């Protein structure tokens, strides 16, 4: 079965940096594109990051580019996110996913069980 285990991420003041860490399991990890998402409490999830099988191609949402850095360990099956810079508008709880094999739309997704960033004082 596919599995994917969110870990790190947490609490952190204003200004300051967490590494969001995704263990998978089940697949064969390179053959797949990666993402994180974030859902804000009242608001859509929301794509955050995405990585391409190899790690060749990335892509970043416009409010977190240069903040935030998506990468994978091929050898490790991990996806991490490195976030520095983090700011109130960051608080969520974030999921990664695997993107499903081409041509599947994103109903074929597997997530993560999600894990909270908290900004805060």
């Known amino acids: 079965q596919v599995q994917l285990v969110e870990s790190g991420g947490g609490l952190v003041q204003p200004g300051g940096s967490l590494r969001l860490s995704c263990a998978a399991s089940g697949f064969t990890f390179s053959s797949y594109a990666m993402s994180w998402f974030r859902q804000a409490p009242g608001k859509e999830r929301e794509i955050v990051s995405a990585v391409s099988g190899s790690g060749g191609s990335t892509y970043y949402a416009d409010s977190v580019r240069g903040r935030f850095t998506i990468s994978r360990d091929n050898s490790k099956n991990t996806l991490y996110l490195q976030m520095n810079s983090l700011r109130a508008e960051d608080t969520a709880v974030y999921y990664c996913?695997?993107?499903?094999?081409?041509?599947?739309?994103?109903?074929?997704?597997?997530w993560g069980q999600g894990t909270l960033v908290t900004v805060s004082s």
């Open positions: 996913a695997r993107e499903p094999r081409i041509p599947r739309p994103p109903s074929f997704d597997y």
